């Protein structure tokens with residue numbers, strides 16, 4: 138299942154294909170397979186709203202605002218690993234979640250309907 | 253969650269992005285989160301068959317037959333609100349549901365396989 | 368629901384549009400609608416990894432290796448029906464499942480990110 | 483000129499309040515109602531993950547305490563209720579034609595299969611299961627309901643594997659020498675844990691895991707006295723125990739198809755139950771402990787030991803299961819030693835006096851009273867020594883006593899190596915794509 | 918003296934005098950995602966590769 142989450146950065150995104158196929162595969166044990174299936178749903182609920190519909194390591198067109206800890210995004214991209222940088226951007230998640238639905242998904246969704 | 257369903261028409265389709273992210277988020281209460289998760293499934297079961305795979309406010313290529321209350325579809329598009337027009341087209345839903353799978357999804361699905 | 372699975376081959380793929388819309392539509396009966404909804408999920412879990420994101424009768428770009436019972440794949444395509452050929456390729460399923468994630472989905476996913 | 487992207491990354495490593503299920507493997511009380519156990523060779527070792535545990539604060543201990551009490555009560559359901567016997571029992575001492583001097587020969591009335599017909603029989607009981615009112619009441623008819631256990635199940639610890647729910651992950655560090663907590667660098671993940679045995683006792687764990695190199699003292703606040711100080715043992719100690727009474731077990735039917743067992747008679751060598759401990763093995767143990775308590779209290783400290791203070795013998799002495807019998811054994815010859823000043827501090831076997839009871843109260847849940855069916859033959863059971871409980875009581879001199887009473891500390895003693903993480907696979911890392 | 922026939926080991930239980938012991942027929946249906954199959958074919962020897970289905 139999991140592996141190499143510890144010491145790498147970005148090269149962990151090379152192996153983001155085993156991380157899903159093993160994922161999701163009385164009454165007290167039946168809380169499992171409900172919240173377990175509510176997860177993989179509620180993110181893919183909003184993942185279709187992100188624009189990236191399936192699994193593509195993909196880019197949107199919303200800007201990264203540089204107010205959100207602008208620290209050497211070519212340099213920290215490769216050396217300084219995840220679980221460190223995640224705490225740095227742990228504060229700004231909800232605000233991006235408003236920008237996932239307004240930039241591409243209020244304007245650009247109603248611009249292909251012009252034709 | 254919900255809002256502006258009352259007095260507008262078409263401009264309600266501008267804000268069809270909050271309407272999903274809050275959606276789906278003993279034994280007698282456990283009927284919930286089963287039929288609650290059977291919904292958002294059984295429509296997206298057939299929504300992949302419509303051709304529009306994810307969330308796009310999108311157009312197909314099947315014709316609107318004008319036998320289905322042909323009433324000023326540029327004029328009623330903006331003024332006369334939903335929940336009125338829905339009763340007008342409440343009768344013709346099942347027939348469109350046969351036309352969602354035959355027009356684009358019997359012919360056109362087996363026309364990109366020619367190459 | 369089902370039909371014509373017996374005596375045809377390939378022309379059964381013409382009618383692969385009724386085969387999903389009727390699909391998925393105390394405690395002892397509540398094992399149903401859990402494993403019933405775990406199915407249509409765990410394949411579409413990996414079907415998004417195949418590259419074909421929704422319902423398209425679609426082709427990938429991974430090669431069919433000809434070590435896997437190379438028997439007249441224009442001839443057996445139409446005459447010799449399914450449930451016979453399926454036993455012929457019953458052995459080589461798991462290996463293709465490693466080739467669904469490495470050919471298109473290790474290389475080609477990180478080749479559109481170059482731009 | 484940065485343009486944020488969306489991923490399915492690995493770092494999900496949050497807290498996991500969660501449920502959990504088992505992977506265990508006859509209808510013995512575990513009932514094999516988990517899953518068939520996979521060979522699970524998937525301790526996938528990870529590279530350099532600084533993660534700190536908290537063995538004192540997790541829900542794995544809290545669920546494990548909740549599971550077994552519910553599970554063991556589930557085995558108690560289809561058995562015979564058997565409360566017509568709470569009557570005016572009258573007894574005497576066991577007669578031996580004459581001698582000097584733990585048994586009571588009891589005159590006794592009871593119903594039969596038919597509703598009206600009575601039954602004047604006699605049986606035997608111990609000391610601590612009967613009370614004076616000569617009329618002798620049972621020990622629990624203040625407020626209880628006596629319940630027989632079914633004589634087919636076994637009270638043996640049959641080990642339980644645990645597996646994560648589909649979507650979470652079980653984490654364990656293979657690292658060494660925690661002080662209870664610790665930012666353990668090396669780590670591996672599993673979907674399924676190893677087998678842990680359903681044992682239950684106080685003042686001494688048994689049949690447990692072993693240490694790495696030495697004693698690993700475990701606590702929260704050594705400067706607090708009200709803690710329960712855990713002591714991990716390096717090398718296990720053989721404990722032989724017995725109930726050397728050739729005993730005859732007879733059977734009767736109290737009513738409409740309700741069987742009952744009782745101690746009929748013993749064949750004739752009245753003895754006392756006991757346990758041998760190798761003497762020179764035990765002194766070799768305690769030198770390791772004071773070697774570490776110098777390091778946590780001082781170089782000029784006097785380590786003393788004593789027995790338990792008081793309370794019930796469930797709190798005082800060593801609670802102990804053996805082979806379908808529930809012992810209670812006095813352990814005064816194990817903590818009669820004082821180690822002095824932390825500077826220059828065989829072929830023998832000390833033996834402990836052990837008592838026998840039949841009316842138990844498991845986990846202090848007052849009202850539930852389970853009966854012990856006496857069994858025929860003799861009693862022999864052998865166990866390792868793995869875990870100890872000490873209590874700092876309230877000069878540099880210091881006395882320790884064998885504490886205990888919460889069985890949660892027993893399961894926490896053998897589940898400190900684990901933690902569970904929730905999974906939320908979503909990463910938003912910007913690059914220069916824009917399109 | 919005549920004992921009842923089951924007070925070896927049992928517990929006698931009356932049935933409620935309102936229910937009926939009549940066979941009221943039961944249809945069975947598959948769970949959502951499976952299928953019930955039947956051959957209309959003839960003269961099995963218990964088993965049989967039935968062609969029509």
Ligand SMILES: *[C@@H]1O[C@H](CO)[C@@H](O[C@@H]2O[C@H](CO)[C@@H](O[C@@H]3O[C@H](CO[C@H]4O[C@H](CO)[C@@H](O)[C@H](O)[C@@H]4O)[C@@H](O)[C@H](O[C@H]4O[C@H](CO)[C@@H](O)[C@H](O)[C@@H]4O[C@H]4O[C@H](CO)[C@@H](O)[C@H](O)[C@@H]4O)[C@@H]3O)[C@H](O)[C@H]2NC(C)=O)[C@H](O)[C@H]1NC(C)=O
Pocket residue numbers: 635636637638639681688689803804805806857858859862863864865866
């Ligand atoms: C700490 O860990 C140790 C081991 O890791 C553990 O010790 C083991 O304890 C168990 C239970 O106390 C022991 O199991 C019992 O062993 C006896 C003796 O069996 C030996 O001798 C016979 C004949 O001499 C051989 O056939 C056998 O192979 C052994 O060599 C058995 O008699 C027991 O079986 C009976 O009891 C079971 C439960 O009641 C039944 O399931 C089983 O079918 C047998 O029942 C029959 O006899 C009963 C007699 O009264 C009768 O009532 C029944 O109706 C039926 O007729 C049982 O297997 C095991 O040997 C110990 N092993 C070691 C190495 O010591 C400790 O118990 C553990 N600590 C704690 C607290 O649990």
Ligand SMILES: *[C@@H]1O[C@H](CO)[C@@H](O[C@@H]2O[C@H](CO)[C@@H](O[C@@H]3O[C@H](CO)[C@@H](O)[C@H](O[C@H]4O[C@H](CO)[C@@H](O)[C@H](O)[C@@H]4O)[C@@H]3O)[C@H](O)[C@H]2NC(C)=O)[C@H](O)[C@H]1NC(C)=O
Pocket residue numbers: 574575583584
């Ligand atoms: C059934 O047997 C039990 C024990 O098997 C027995 O209970 C014991 O009875 C004796 C005698 O009554 C008690 O013995 C006392 O013990 C203390 C300390 O051990 C002694 O100091 C006592 O001696 C003083 O008291 C006597 C009372 O007359 C004086 O005669 C004597 O000179 C001393 O002043 C005394 O021996 C013992 O305490 C109990 N055991 C318990 C647990 O209570 C019981 O009596 C037997 N049943 C019958 C009906 O006899």
Ligand SMILES: *[C@@H]1O[C@H](CO)[C@@H](O[C@@H]2O[C@H](CO)[C@@H](O[C@@H]3O[C@H](CO)[C@@H](O)[C@H](O)[C@@H]3O)[C@H](O)[C@H]2NC(C)=O)[C@H](O)[C@H]1NC(C)=O
Pocket residue numbers: 720721722758759760831864
């Ligand atoms: C608890 O009981 C067990 C067995 O019930 C004891 O184990 C026994 O220990 C003795 C010596 O400690 C062993 O005897 C030796 O055996 C060797 C091997 O043949 C022999 O060469 C020696 O001369 C000597 O006789 C014995 O084999 C062993 N038995 C078993 C089954 O292990 C144990 O010592 C007891 N412990 C205590 C503290 O009483």
Ligand SMILES: *[C@@H]1O[C@H](CO)[C@@H](O[C@@H]2O[C@H](CO)[C@@H](O)[C@H](O)[C@H]2NC(C)=O)[C@H](O)[C@H]1NC(C)=O
Pocket residue numbers: 613624625
């Ligand atoms: C049940 O009744 C018995 C009657 O002997 C009580 O036993 C004694 O009670 C006193 C007062 O609590 C204690 O000092 C003794 O130690 C008790 N004797 C024993 C052998 O324990 C008992 O307390 C009563 N229980 C309740 C809940 O009322």
Ligand SMILES: *[C@@H]1O[C@H](CO)[C@@H](O[C@@H]2O[C@H](CO)[C@@H](O)[C@H](O)[C@H]2NC(C)=O)[C@H](O)[C@H]1NC(C)=O
Pocket residue numbers: 703705706707
């Ligand atoms: C361990 O517990 C003890 C007492 O339970 C704590 O000791 C207190 O410490 C503060 C400041 O150091 C003193 O003002 C108090 O007087 C102490 N308590 C007593 C009863 O004297 C100690 O802080 C705890 N340790 C930790 C790490 O929390």
Ligand SMILES: *[C@@H]1O[C@H](CO)[C@@H](O[C@@H]2O[C@H](CO)[C@@H](O)[C@H](O)[C@H]2NC(C)=O)[C@H](O)[C@H]1NC(C)=O
Pocket residue numbers: 576577587588604606746747748
């Ligand atoms: C308890 O006392 C009773 C007194 O009746 C003993 O029962 C008698 O024992 C003798 C020989 O041991 C038999 O011949 C009698 O038939 C027994 N009486 C009955 C009514 O069965 C009994 O033995 C004593 N208990 C013990 C353990 O010795």
Ligand SMILES: *[C@@H]1O[C@H](CO)[C@@H](O[C@@H]2O[C@H](CO)[C@@H](O)[C@H](O)[C@H]2NC(C)=O)[C@H](O)[C@H]1NC(C)=O
Pocket residue numbers: 789795798799812813814
């Ligand atoms: C366990 O054995 C010890 C043997 O010493 C008993 O302790 C003695 O008890 C008497 C009276 O109860 C005291 O006068 C002694 O000072 C005690 N000695 C010690 C070392 O504590 C103890 O009562 C026994 N406990 C049980 C439950 O049997």
Ligand SMILES: *[C@@H]1O[C@H](CO)[C@@H](O[C@@H]2O[C@H](CO)[C@@H](O)[C@H](O)[C@H]2NC(C)=O)[C@H](O)[C@H]1NC(C)=O
Pocket residue numbers: 718864865866
């Ligand atoms: C008590 O612990 C000791 C650890 O040394 C156990 O002894 C070994 O246990 C392993 C696995 O249980 C066996 O493969 C070895 O053969 C054992 N060695 C010896 C010399 O016995 C011992 O089994 C434990 N006690 C019990 C009852 O299991």
Ligand SMILES: *[C@@H]1O[C@H](CO)[C@@H](O[C@@H]2O[C@H](CO)[C@@H](O)[C@H](O)[C@H]2NC(C)=O)[C@H](O)[C@H]1NC(C)=O
Pocket residue numbers: 925
């Ligand atoms: C219950 O008691 C009755 C007493 O008559 C037993 O009935 C007879 O038992 C013998 C021995 O098994 C049989 O040969 C007879 O055929 C039985 N009579 C009838 C009418 O069946 C009965 O066996 C007892 N049941 C049990 C389980 O002990």
Ligand SMILES: *[C@@H]1O[C@H](CO)[C@@H](O)[C@H](O)[C@H]1NC(C)=O
Pocket residue numbers: 570571572589590591600602
């Ligand atoms: C048992 O019952 C008999 C009569 O049924 C009576 O004579 C006897 O005293 C009773 N025994 C006790 C200990 O009360």
Ligand SMILES: *[C@@H]1O[C@H](CO)[C@@H](O)[C@H](O)[C@H]1NC(C)=O
Pocket residue numbers: 534661663664665
């Ligand atoms: C115990 O370990 C923690 C870190 O896990 C540390 O903060 C604390 O000082 C340690 N205490 C002792 C006595 O080593």
Ligand SMILES: *[C@@H]1O[C@H](CO)[C@@H](O)[C@H](O)[C@H]1NC(C)=O
Pocket residue numbers: 728729749859860
């Ligand atoms: C106990 O005594 C009986 C005779 O009353 C005998 O048959 C039995 O073998 C004895 N028990 C043992 C363990 O030898």
Ligand SMILES: *[C@@H]1O[C@H](CO)[C@@H](O)[C@H](O)[C@H]1NC(C)=O
Pocket residue numbers: 765819827
């Ligand atoms: C244990 O042995 C040491 C020497 O090996 C000795 O000094 C000590 O007194 C012994 N313990 C007791 C309680 O006598």
Ligand SMILES: *[C@@H]1O[C@H](CO)[C@@H](O)[C@H](O)[C@H]1NC(C)=O
Pocket residue numbers: 962964965966
């Ligand atoms: C019964 O039918 C099976 C095939 O379904 C066949 O193998 C077997 O020989 C038949 N037996 C008889 C007695 O006809």
